[PDB]
RNA sequence: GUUUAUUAAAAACACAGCACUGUGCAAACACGAAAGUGGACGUAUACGGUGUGACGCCUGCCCGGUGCCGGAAGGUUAAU
RNA sequence: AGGAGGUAAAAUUCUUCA
RNA sequence: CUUGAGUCUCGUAGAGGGGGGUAGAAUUCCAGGUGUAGCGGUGAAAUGCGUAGAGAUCUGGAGGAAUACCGGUGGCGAAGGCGGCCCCCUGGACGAAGACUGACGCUCAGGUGCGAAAGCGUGGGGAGCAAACAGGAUUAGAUACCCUGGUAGUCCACGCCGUAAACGAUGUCGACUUGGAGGUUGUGCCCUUGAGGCGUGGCUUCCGGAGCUAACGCGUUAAGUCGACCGCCUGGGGAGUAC
């Protein structure tokens, strides 16, 4: 589930620094990642349902920070969606 | 299961059977397949293991 | 014809029948005799007496080979189960070794269910 | 890979296409070809022996080798091509020698695969070589009847039989009929299963789709006369008489197998 | 990269190739910057049941630290060679020593 | 009882038949008593421990 | 689509499909006193005969007579 | 005392309102 | 802003899910050797099977499916549901401290997805079991219970069906409320000096309080005491049917 390499090293891309992995930003960077490498693992067997709902669980919780980013400061919320790459 | 006596008795002495497989194994797995009923048949049993 | 002196005594006892066989070591059947074939027939060969004659008459068919010990291989639970292995001892015959061999499988086949009675 | 066209036009919608992507597209290989012409179910006297043959499109043989006496020598399947001349899909093999040749190209074969004949090939699906080194169980098809003959047994798509006994110079083998025949170990054999087996899930779809195969139309008995066919003319769809062949021969049970040479080499009929 | 117990027997027909088997397999691991903690050779060591015919085995334990890959197409090769009857991987929990 | 390669341990928690001897007897913990079921089950497969006794 | 060329072009025939049955290769069958050939330079997902007639829902009850596929104590029984 | 195994063959129906 | 709700480091347990292999036993089929009139079955028999040699017995091989013992009011998941062993991939949950984000929360019509068994479509496979069906018994009648056979099905790939006593017949989340006996999983401390001793969390099982209820019972995991939101009921039959 996301090597610690990768958690650690995400962190210290969006955030202040590091231990501020608590960010909004650096949360719906950690998700994201996961998204996109659960993709892959998803394109593949297509019988994982069980596992499924946790990816979906996974969208649907960036999907509401997202809104709460948005929320609050939109700045942070654009130089993210542009970044991240995503929301089309 | 198995017996290999000594010399001094020919009487067959083997109540092993009456104590692992014979019929404490056989025996359930003989008539229906029970399935999920079994756990109601422990529960009333273990139910009566108390007192 | 031949002249052997061990054996095997392999039972078969089951709740309708059982069926009594004496080889050599080698597993080729020397002689056998049913709990049916001494007459008996239903609930009269579902006892240990017919398997006690039964032994009796599988020994009086195999003795023509000198067979003096053998050993025997019980299989199939029912009647007739001890009281089998109980005549050829007092038949005459060294027994020596007595193994189970009750096929006992691991969970595989689905047996039947119609029993209602 | 099995396909089902849509209902695009009458004759069309009770279609189901059997292609095959791992199919050589194009012309064959030249080396390995033949004349081959088209009877039409006559024999030298220009007699009509078989009746239903006439038409279908024009065919071509392909050089396909069932002996497999090339041992010792390893080879590679370069291709897979189409046989119409039988139902199963051949395969040209390359060995290290510089020969090709064609083969039933087995269920489990795919272009780059390590064959070999001989009484030291290995024990896998596309190798050929004598039942007396095969294991009993091992499935196996294109079997021979006689050592030097070749690949009688088991030869068309999805076909396959199975050895499953010894006892002496011979072996019984399962045939799909479900018929076991004993034949000398002495004959060789190929081990796993023949071409495709989407074949017999075709069903054309129209009536011309089975004129261009060198299948004519089927006529009935009750249909023709009495001066024609045994089964009379009638006046209304009539019988009254015996499911009979235009001959006067009994049928739909009527057993006609006469050899009593080859009824030694039987174990069990099929059933 | 995880710890594998491995633990195959060679038939006793092969066992002069064992001592070769040991070369190639830690030649491979070391390869791709594997490890090794331990390696045993208990010999021809007696069976419980008649597996595959034949009586007593040649047992050879084994123990090392290579990754979820070249540990993957190491039981390709013991399927693929006749020699060897079992095989057998198992846990990691990191690594031992001795023992047995 | 930690470990399934410890046979001389593992020995004395199976019945002469081969079948495992539960808690009720041995008096094993319970963390523990799964754990050493789970060593033979081990052990039975690399030929270490017979399942039956008919070998 | 086919058919009574030249009074019948139709509900007839054919039809893909489905089913039963025969067939282990020198196949069954067919043309032939025979040889031989066709079937097929194919091998049961093949081939021949029969039946029905896309498809959808289904295809029941009955084995005496007449046939077919087997077994068989006794009885009758040709040539020799 | 605790535990395990074994141990039964079929036999319909009875109006309505109090 | 941090106590809700999350993230991060490390570690732990599990028939959770998916995919690919594997081993043993038994049954069935098949082959060889030996052997011979019985075998098989039931309450009693019979149909069936057998002189082309069964059953029984010895050896070997193939195939399908399910994993005895372990195994337990034991474990996991939202529910349905989930049991040999091993590898690969993977979800979630939980604990010891500290740090960080800072209500980013709960629920939620529509809609969407998943969803035992049975059934269905396109194929494969098919040991055993087994609707329909066939042939014997029972019976006043037996289109059933019983026995001998046996197709679909059960299995596998893909695409549908989305139906159940799909229940704990109790929706989910949060807070508070006397306890006792066990199961199961971490962790702190102590001559670790007893296989333990002394505490603190998550989850689960039974009993039992107040209280609640028509009663049965439930009873810190509530049907107790409150709060938020969604669904649903208004007599039975009609009917979970008609349009």
Redesign the interface.
């Given at each position: 589930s996301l090597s610690t390499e990768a958690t650690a090293k995400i962190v210290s891309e969006f955030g202040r620094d590091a231990n501020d992995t608590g960010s909004t930003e650096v949360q719906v960077a950690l998700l994201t990642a996961q998204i996109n490498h659960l993709q892959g693992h998803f394109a593949e067997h297509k019988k994982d349902h069980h596992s499924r709902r946790g990816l979906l669980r996974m969208v649907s919780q960036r999907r509401k920070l997202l809104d709460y980013l948005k929320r609050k400061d939109v700045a942070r919320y654009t130089q993210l969606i542009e970044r991240l790459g995503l929301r089309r | 299961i198995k017996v290999r006596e000594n010399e001094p008795f020919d009487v067959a002495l083997r109540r092993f059977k009456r104590s692992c497989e014979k019929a404490g194994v056989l025996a359930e797995v003989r008539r229906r397949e029970f399935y999920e009923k079994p756990t109601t048949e422990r529960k009333r049993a273990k139910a009566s293991a108390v007192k | 014809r031949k002249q052997v002196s061990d054996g095997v005594a392999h039972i078969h006892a089951s709740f309708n029948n059982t069926i009594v066989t004496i080889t050599d070591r080698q597993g080729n059947a020397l002689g056998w005799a049913t709990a049916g074939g001494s007459g008996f027939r239903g609930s009269r060969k579902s006892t240990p007496f017919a398997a006690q004659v039964a032994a009796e008459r599988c020994a009086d068919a195999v003795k023509e080979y000198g067979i003096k010990n053998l050993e025997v291989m019980v299989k199939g639970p029912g009647p007739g189960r001890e009281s089998t292995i109980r005549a050829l001892n007092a038949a005459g015959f060294r027994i020596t070794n007595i193994t189970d061999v009750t096929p006992i499988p691991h969970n595989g086949c689905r047996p039947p269910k119609k029993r209602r009675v | 890979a099995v396909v089902k066209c849509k209902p695009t036009s009458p004759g069309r919608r009770h279609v189901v296409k059997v292609v095959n992507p791992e199919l050589h597209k194009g012309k064959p290989f030249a080396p390995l070809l033949e004349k081959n012409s088209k009877s039409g179910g006559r024999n030298n006297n220009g007699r009509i022996t078989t009746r239903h043959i006439g038409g279908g499109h024009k065919q071509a043989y392909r050089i396909v080798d069932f002996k497999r006496n090339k041992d010792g020598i390893p080879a590679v399947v370069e291709r897979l091509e189409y046989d119409p001349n039988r139902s199963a899909n051949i395969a040209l093999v390359l060995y290290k020698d510089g020969e090709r040749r064609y083969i039933l190209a087995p269920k489990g074969l795919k272009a780059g695969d390590q064959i070999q004949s001989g009484v030291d090939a290995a024990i896998k699906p596309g190798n050929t070589l004598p039942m007396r080194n095969i294991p009993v169980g091992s499935t196996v098809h294109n079997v021979e009847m006689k050592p030097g003959k070749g690949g009688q047994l088991a030869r068309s798509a999805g076909t396959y039989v199975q050895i499953v006994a010894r006892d002496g110079a011979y072996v019984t083998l399962r045939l799909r009929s479900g018929e076991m025949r004993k034949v000398e170990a002495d004959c060789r054999a190929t081990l796993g299963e023949v071409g495709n087996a989407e074949h017999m899930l075709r069903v054309l779809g129209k009536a011309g789709a089975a004129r261009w195969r060198g299948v004519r139309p089927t006529v009935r008995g009750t249909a023709m006369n009495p001066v024609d066919h045994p089964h009379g003319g009638g006046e209304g769809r009539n019988f009254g008489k015996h499911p009979v062949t235009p001959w006067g021969v009994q049928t739909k049970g009527k057993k006609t197998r006469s050899n009593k040479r080859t009824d030694k080499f039987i174990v069990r009929r099929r059933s | 990269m995880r710890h594998y117990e491995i633990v195959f027997m060679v038939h006793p027909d092969q066992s002069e190739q064992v001592p070769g088997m040991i070369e190639r397999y830690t030649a491979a691991i070391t390869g791709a910057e594997g490890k090794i903690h331990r390696l045993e050779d208990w010999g021809r060591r007696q069976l419980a049941y008649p597996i595959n015919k034949l009586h007593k085995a040649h047992y050879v334990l084994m123990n090392v630290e290579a990754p979820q890959e070249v540990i993957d197409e190491l039981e390709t090769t013991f399927r693929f060679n006749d020699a060897v009857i079992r095989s057998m991987v198992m846990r990691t929990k990191h690594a031992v020593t001795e023992a047995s | 009882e930690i470990?399934y390669?410890?046979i001389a341990t593992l020995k004395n928690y199976i019945?002469?038949?081969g079948?495992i001897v539960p808690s009720r007897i041995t008096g094993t913990r319970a963390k523990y008593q799964r754990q050493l079921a789970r060593a033979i089950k081990?052990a039975r497969?690399?030929?270490?421990?017979?399942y039956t006794?008919?070998?």
């Open positions: - | - | - | - | - | 470990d390669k410890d019945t002469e038949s079948k081990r497969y690399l030929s270490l421990l017979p006794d008919r070998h």
